[PDB]
Scaffold this active site. Structure first.
Site, PDB file in Angstrom:
ATOM      1  N   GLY A 129       0.817  -1.204   0.000  1.00 29.01           N
ATOM      2  CA  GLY A 129       0.000   0.000   0.000  1.00 29.01           C
ATOM      3  C   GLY A 129       0.846   1.247   0.000  1.00 29.01           C
ATOM      4  CB  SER A 130       0.648   4.474  -0.663  1.00 31.13           C
ATOM      5  OG  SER A 130      -0.757   4.523  -0.846  1.00 31.13           O
ATOM      6  N   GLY A 131       1.999   4.526   2.589  1.00 33.67           N
ATOM      7  CA  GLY A 131       2.091   5.307   3.816  1.00 33.67           C
ATOM      8  C   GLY A 131       2.460   6.762   3.573  1.00 33.67           C
TER       9      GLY A 131
ATOM     10  CG  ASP B  56      -0.003  10.787   8.655  1.00 31.40           C
ATOM     11  OD1 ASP B  56      -0.783  11.602   8.096  1.00 31.40           O
ATOM     12  OD2 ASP B  56       1.231  10.937   8.692  1.00 31.40           O
TER      13      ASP B  56
END
Ligand SMILES: CCCS(=O)(=O)Nc1ccc(F)c(C(=O)c2c[nH]c3ncc(Cl)cc23)c1F
Length: 266
Positions: free
Chosen positions: A17-19, A128
């Site tokens: 995925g994307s952090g 986040d």
């Protein structure tokens, strides 16, 4: 420095995925690893010094409930290497699709609050927190991700709001803005996800509608959807975390102490 994994040692595989600032991949370097590929390729002198300062922070901030930093890379892209968590993310479990016993549901919250009590004690604002950033390593210990590059998150602003916003505090939408109390709100959404097995505002299939309404404080998670077996004290703590007025929210020391107390329940 002696944390720079040399050229051609990590075997970058499956895209996960994307952090924050990058893209997560499953890698291999003396066993299973995770690699966050940052969106930086040709680091200027200032860029390389900035990244090496955050690596210095990363190797000085260690905890059982936060991801374990293993090293970094410069070529071909700037990357962060951490430990791999076999049980994937909490989002993957809770929402895709359903089941955990109330004891475990309280245990994840407890372990997330433990890690966040460590991060707030080190004066680190997560910025986040979400269930996709809470990983289940098994040994059965929760691991917090995306806490790193905190100074870089402060120095910039973010536009990468979508696709997220679900864990964003009302003051974070209407652009202080990021605080320890905004982190408490995101944790409150995590508690909601845990006790309800549903995401807040899952009926809405629009972004700007959620931005207007959550931001103005006319919308909030539907607490009536909480499980019947969810202890009173937990539904109440969840409400305190989710409070619209940011300075009414509890601190992680008080959050953890409430979870510890409501965990008994023997
Ligand atoms: C010690 C620094 C941690 S971080 O803040 O930079 N965030 C970060 C950096 C690199 C990563 F690979 C990850 C990450 O998402 C994962 C680390 N281990 C994992 N195991 C399983 C999954 Cl699905 C994801 C991960 C991640 F959350």
């Amino acid at each position: 420095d002696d944390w720079e994994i040399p050229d051609g040692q990590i075997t970058v595989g499956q895209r996960i995925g994307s952090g924050s600032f990058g893209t997560v991949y499953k890698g291999k370097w003396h066993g299973d690893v995770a690699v966050k590929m940052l969106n930086v390729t040709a680091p200027t002198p200032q860029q390389l010094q900035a990244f090496k300062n955050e690596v210095g922070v990363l190797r000085k901030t260690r905890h059982v409930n936060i991801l374990l930093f293993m090293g970094y890379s410069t070529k071909p892209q700037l990357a962060i290497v951490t430990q791999w968590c076999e049980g994937s993310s909490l989002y993957h479990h809770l929402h895709a699709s359903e089941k955990f016993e109330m004891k475990k549901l309280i245990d994840i919250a407890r372990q997330t609050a433990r890690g966040m009590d460590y991060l707030h004690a080190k004066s680190i604002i997560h910025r986040d927190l979400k269930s996709n950033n809470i990983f289940l390593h098994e040994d059965n210990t929760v691991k917090i991700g995306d806490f790193g590059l905190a100074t870089v998150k402060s120095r910039w602003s973010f536009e990468q709001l979508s696709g997220s916003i679900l864990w964003m505090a009302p003051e974070v939408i209407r652009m202080n803005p990021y605080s320890f109390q905004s982190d408490v709100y995101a944790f409150g959404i995590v508690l909601y996800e845990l006790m309800t097995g549903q995401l807040p505002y899952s009926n809405i299939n629009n972004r700007d509608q959620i931005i207007e309404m959550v931001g103005r404080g006319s919308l909030s998670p539907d607490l009536s959807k909480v499980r019947s077996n969810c202890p009173k004290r937990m539904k109440r703590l969840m409400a305190e975390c989710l409070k619209k007025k940011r300075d009414e929210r509890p601190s992680f020391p008080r959050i953890l102490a409430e979870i510890e107390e409501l965990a008994r329940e023997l």
